[PDB]
From TrEMBL:
The keyword Flavoprotein does not apply. GO terms for molecular function: acyltransferase activity; glycosyltransferase activity; hydrolase activity, acting on carbon-nitrogen (but not peptide) bonds, in linear amides; metal ion binding; monooxygenase activity. Keywords: Acyltransferase, Glycosyltransferase, Metal-binding, Monooxygenase, Oxidoreductase, Transferase, Zinc. Pfam families: PIG-L. This is Dbv21 protein. SUPFAM superfamilies: LmbE-like (SSF102588). Zn(2+) binds at residues 11, 14, 133. The keyword Metal-binding applies. The gene is dbv21.
Length: 242
């Protein structure tokens, strides 16, 4: 039920990159979309050399507020998909045990669910094994289950176009069968246009010779050679509870 979709993105870019066309298609179909990003917290200059290195790679200068730049990128992108944005308080791995973080994230996701009253929640399956993706996913599974909201896990992009598939779920959980969500040409066009806004991240992901848009078209194509642009998600089955 796509009437009210709440997508939980680990970082500023992940939702658009992975489910952007399905989100666009939901909005075109008359549904309501909100993307909440967990790791969208504030940090102004001055930064650590380790952060300066990541910033320099995004094309940012020492005095520029990076998380602000990225929050602005996220707003521009989501606006093009007709999706609402909500920015979470957590700091990217790069400006900073596991249980305390998951529990903190879960509380905020519960607060977001109560506020947005969604009929469907989405988050990443955490292909690529980023610890922020694992934390976001795990917290979202707990929060959506507590609030009895249906949930799907998406195939992280572009990461899935290069490698893996097998994600390591919490105990007692496994993935249901994968489902391809097909979209029309305008939803795909809107996705790719929205992706251009995350210029900071695309300076790596669509760096010289990265095939990003081609790679994404090819990936979608591999999954359904005859039937246009598509994105993969899975339902979650709980075979065992504590
Ligand atoms: Zn990410």
């Amino acid at each position: 039920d796509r009437t009210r979709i709440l997508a939980i993105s680990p970082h500023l870019d992940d939702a658009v990159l992975s489910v952007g066309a399905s989100l666009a298609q939901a909005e075109q179909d008359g549904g309501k979309v909100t993307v909440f990003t967990v790791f969208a917290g504030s940090a102004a200059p001055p930064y650590s050399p380790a952060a300066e290195r990541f910033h320099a790679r995004w094309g940012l200068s020492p005095t520029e507020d990076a998380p602000l730049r990225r929050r602005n990128e996220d707003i521009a992108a989501l606006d093009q998909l007709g999706a609402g944005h909500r920015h979470g308080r957590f700091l990217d791995a790069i400006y900073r045990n596991n249980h305390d973080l998951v529990a903190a994230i879960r509380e905020d996701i519960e607060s977001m669910i109560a506020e947005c009253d969604p009929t469907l929640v989405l988050t990443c399956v955490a292909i690529g094994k980023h610890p922020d993706h694992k934390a976001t996913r795990d917290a979202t599974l707990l929060a959506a289950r507590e609030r009895g909201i249906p949930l799907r896990l998406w195939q992280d992009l572009p990461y899935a176009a290069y490698s893996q598939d097998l994600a390591e779920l919490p105990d007692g959980l496994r993935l249901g069968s994968p489902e391809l969500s097909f979209v029309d040409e305008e939803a795909r066009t809107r996705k790719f246009q929205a992706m251009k806004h995350y210029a900071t991240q695309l300076s790596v992901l669509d760096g010289p010779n990265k095939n990003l848009f081609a790679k994404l078209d090819e990936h979608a194509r591999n999954a359904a050679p005859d039937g246009g642009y598509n994105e993969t998600t899975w339902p979650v089955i709980r075979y065992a509870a504590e």
